[PDB]
Amino acid sequence: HRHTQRQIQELESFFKECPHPDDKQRKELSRDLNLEPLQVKFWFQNKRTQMKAQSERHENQILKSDNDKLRAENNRYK
Amino acid sequence: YHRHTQRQIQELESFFKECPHPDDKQRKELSRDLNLEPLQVKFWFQNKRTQMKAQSERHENQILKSDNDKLR
DNA sequence: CTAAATGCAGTGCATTTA
DNA sequence: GTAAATGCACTGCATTTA
Lengths: 78, 72
Fold this sequence. Notes:
By secondary structure, chain A is mainly α.
């Protein structure tokens, strides 16, 4: 119900390299690490949602704090 | 797999307006009231919940984004 | 967050049908 | 003979279900 660490390493290793596979690209990976490609297909989409979601989350949790800290500076000036 | 009936989801969208964080008791009736496994019921809300914070902060994002840039 | 999966456009090319 | 259709894949993403 989850994937192998041996496996998942090579997943993330490829996505930094080639974050968008063709079918052909997808198939060969599976044969290398004993998985189904539609699985492989699915993951590659979900990793893409991951980067979208986190790039937003970090930013929001950050800018809220950054726009918060700057405001305190403005009042110390006034 | 198997998605959820429109009857289900419509009642969902209708109730989600009311108590977007519902307790076991009400979860228990709704689960029964709507031919559901309450885990499923418990689940969908968690996601339904999770979606909105993301959707809201994205608008929080885009609105805080255009304001800062346009000033320059 | 994961793992699995669906729904809807849209895109390209090869083959029918009109 | 040609142009428009249709059948078949694939892509890509956002959303849903557990």
